[PDB]
Amino acid sequence: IVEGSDAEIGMSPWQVMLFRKSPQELLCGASLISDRWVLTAAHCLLYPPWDKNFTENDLLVRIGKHSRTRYERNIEKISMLEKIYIHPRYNWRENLDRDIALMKLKKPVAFSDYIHPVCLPDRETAASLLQAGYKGRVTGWGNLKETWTTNVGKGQPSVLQVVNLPIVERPVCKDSTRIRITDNMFCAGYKPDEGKRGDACQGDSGGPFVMKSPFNNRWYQMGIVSWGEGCDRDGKYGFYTHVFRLKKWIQKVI
Amino acid sequence: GEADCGLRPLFEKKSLEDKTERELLESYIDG
Amino acid sequence: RPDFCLEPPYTGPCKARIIRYFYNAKAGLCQTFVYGGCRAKRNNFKSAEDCMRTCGGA
């Protein structure tokens, strides 16, 4: 998360960490939506085609964490994945459309002050909240600055970062990139003139983009961190998977 | 489960508000 | 020495943090870079071994 800030303890009890020791190559976020299901981006589970690997597992889902590096004993829980379901129409070498993936945990997790599921949006919520100018929250352990290897100053955060960004008008998203966006994704972030910065960056993908309903006091997952050209660039915005438009697939699979 | 999804133990259930939460509410009231 | 070994490492638009290896032609050795999860260019290897076997010299 670029230009974000340290989250407080228990701020996002639905934040899940996708980690892999060997190859270390993995850090992605995910969201806890039930005691047995985690939601992430389809691209965090794939490999380049010349790898020829399709087993997809050996990954650890660490739930309840705050610190990126430290092991949190009586707080975090590590679980194994029983099954992984990637949207059969996710397209990388194409539109980057339908970047969504669900994961069934081996055994259901047990909630606590640090672990708790987010609500998924319903027609009404989608209508009330998904409006240009309306702010959402993005959390993650990803890079603090745009980086291809190493960067100046610190690079990765020690604790979960949070940043609240505004949903941007579709036309503006459309005119901000050459990649053909689809109704299944939305963009958020500040415009250059709004004197505020913030963005998701490498390591944040899969994490949740949430909004609090001013009507029922509940947090809803409206998007999933997916892509963006760089991190926190002027005139550029981050794109998120439109959870509401994929809600039916989520339901069907579960 | 879903029944009480979205209500964070250390916050909503305690009638506590995190430090930047209101910035979100403000943007809904004409943002 | 395939042409794609001379190309610089490409992270891409996606935001995952996938540590990978690329052939650094200028140094003549394979190094790690952060790949984003999508739109991988070919100089993107699972391991240094695979990296060297495919790009050893370029």
Swiss-Prot record, chain B:
Protein's name in the database: Thrombin light chain
According to the record, which residues of the full protein are present here?
Answer: 332 to 362 of 622
Curated annotation (Swiss-Prot), chain C:
Query: Which GO molecular function annotations are given, in alphabetical order?
Result: calcium ion binding; molecular function inhibitor activity; potassium channel inhibitor activity; protease binding; serine-type endopeptidase inhibitor activity; sulfate binding; zymogen binding
The entry's localization annotation reads: Secreted
Question: What are the alphabetically sorted keywords of the record?
Answer: Disulfide bond, Pharmaceutical, Protease inhibitor, Secreted, Serine protease inhibitor, Signal
- One GO CC term on file: extracellular space
Q: GO annotations under biological process?
A: negative regulation of platelet aggregation; negative regulation of serine-type endopeptidase activity; negative regulation of thrombin-activated receptor signaling pathway; trypsinogen activation
Taken from the UniProt record, the cysteine pairs bridged by disulfide bonds within this chain are 5-55, 14-38, 30-51
Key word Secreted present in the record?
yes
Point out the annotated site residues (description: Reactive bond for trypsin): 15-16
BPTI/Kunitz inhibitor domain location, by residue? 5-55
Q: What function does this protein fulfil?
A: Inhibits trypsin, kallikrein, chymotrypsin, and plasmin.
Q: What is this protein called?
A: Pancreatic trypsin inhibitor
Lineage of the organism: Eukaryota, Metazoa, Chordata, Craniata, Vertebrata
Full-sequence portion shown in this chain: 36 to 93 of 100
